């Protein structure tokens, strides 16, 4: 079993305003156990876009079924895209930790551009 890797294969995704953007992400292992989260931006001012664990995110749909024990696909879809959604989106693996989950590894990021 190699070490966990978070793979975002797309440098860029172009979406028309109003359409649905797909952000691809794959984890190459399930060790360690822990949730995947999506952010726009890096650093402390990161916007939480999706969280596998908890929370309500009405614009976001996962491509795959995450409740599958064997799942490694963490791609998401964001509906009703407006120009305010442009930015760089990061797929980040967390590990359970003590009290709260802590960042483990991050994908390289995907830039989202609107109106083609």
């Amino acid at each position: 079993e190699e070490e966990l890797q978070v793979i975002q294969p797309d440098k860029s995704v172009l979406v028309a305003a109003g359409e649905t953007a797909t952000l691809r992400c794959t984890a190459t292992s399930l060790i360690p156990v822990g949730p995947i989260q999506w952010f726009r931006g890096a650093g402390p001012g990161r916007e939480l876009i999706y969280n596998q664990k908890e929370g309500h995110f009405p614009r976001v749909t996962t491509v795959s079924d995450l409740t599958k024990r064997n799942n490694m696909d963490f791609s998401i879809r964001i509906g009703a895209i407006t120009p305010a959604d442009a930015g760089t989106y990061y797929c980040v693996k967390f590990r359970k930790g003590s009290p709260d989950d802590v960042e483990f590894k991050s994908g390289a990021g995907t830039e989202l551009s609107v109106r083609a």
Epitope: P9, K11, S12, L14, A42, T88, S113
Partner: antibody, heavy 119, light 109 residues
């Protein structure tokens, strides 16, 4: 091999305009993101702008935002930088750089061309 | 943005010595750090990508290491053509793409 030939640099006055060209050869120009990077005399490397292979994804550095316009012409295998309302701080050697397929680092560079903004 | 700081600005070493150049990021960039070489008067050229991957055609004495916020470019034995300026560049946090300030390797005598 991969080649990037730049041109258009020169001496201009503040507020005037210039146009830089980066003619490519030895690779499929249409499928690579291209960047402009500058280096003021005695200073370090500074990212200026980037344009996707398709030409529709475009970012600028804040210090040039609204004055410079990047574009490409895949039919002529040349990248352009349109510099308008130039300031003294724009004096630099300007390099064109070809990005890696997946990541935003620069695989190949042009020879550079010099822009002097002076009165 | 993410700020990269290279220290020191000038590194003074004798030919054939080991050079160890540092690059520190103000916040984590994981493994998404490149190193460029700039010999006097020439355009920059890529040496290292992905913190540790040697670019095609780059001599073996160049090696990169580190992750997160601390990176190191090592030259095992300095040749004459290695006295130049070296820049690190991160591509995790973008835009903007950001460069370090540069370290110049000068000949000791």
């Amino acid at each position: 091999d991969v080649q990037l030939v730049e041109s258009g640099g020169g001496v201009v006055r503040p507020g005037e305009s210039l146009r830089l060209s980066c003619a490519a050869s030895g690779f499929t120009f249409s499928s690579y993101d291209m960047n402009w990077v500058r280096q003021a005399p005695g200073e370090g490397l500074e990212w200026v702008s980037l344009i996707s292979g398709s030409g529709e994804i475009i970012y600028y550095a804040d210090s040039v935002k609204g004055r410079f316009t990047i574009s490409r012409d895949n039919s002529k295998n040349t990248l352009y930088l349109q510099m308008n309302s130039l300031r003294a701080e724009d004096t630099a050697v300007y390099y064109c750089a070809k990005e890696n397929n997946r990541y935003r680092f620069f695989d190949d560079w042009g020879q550079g061309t010099l822009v002097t903004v002076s009165s | 943005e993410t700020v990269l700081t290279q220290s020191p600005g000038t590194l003074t070493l004798s030919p054939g010595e080991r050079a160890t150049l540092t690059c520190r990021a103000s916040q984590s960039v994981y493994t998404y750090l490149a190193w460029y070489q700039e010999k006097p008067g020439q355009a920059p050229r890529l040496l290292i990508y992905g913190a540790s991957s040697r670019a095609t055609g780059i001599p073996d004495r160049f090696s990169g290491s580190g992750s997160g916020t601390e990176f190191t470019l090592t030259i095992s034995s300095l040749q004459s053509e290695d006295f130049a300026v070296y820049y690190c560049q991160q591509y995790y946090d973008r835009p903007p793409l950001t460069f370090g300030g540069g370290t110049k390797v000068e000949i000791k005598r």
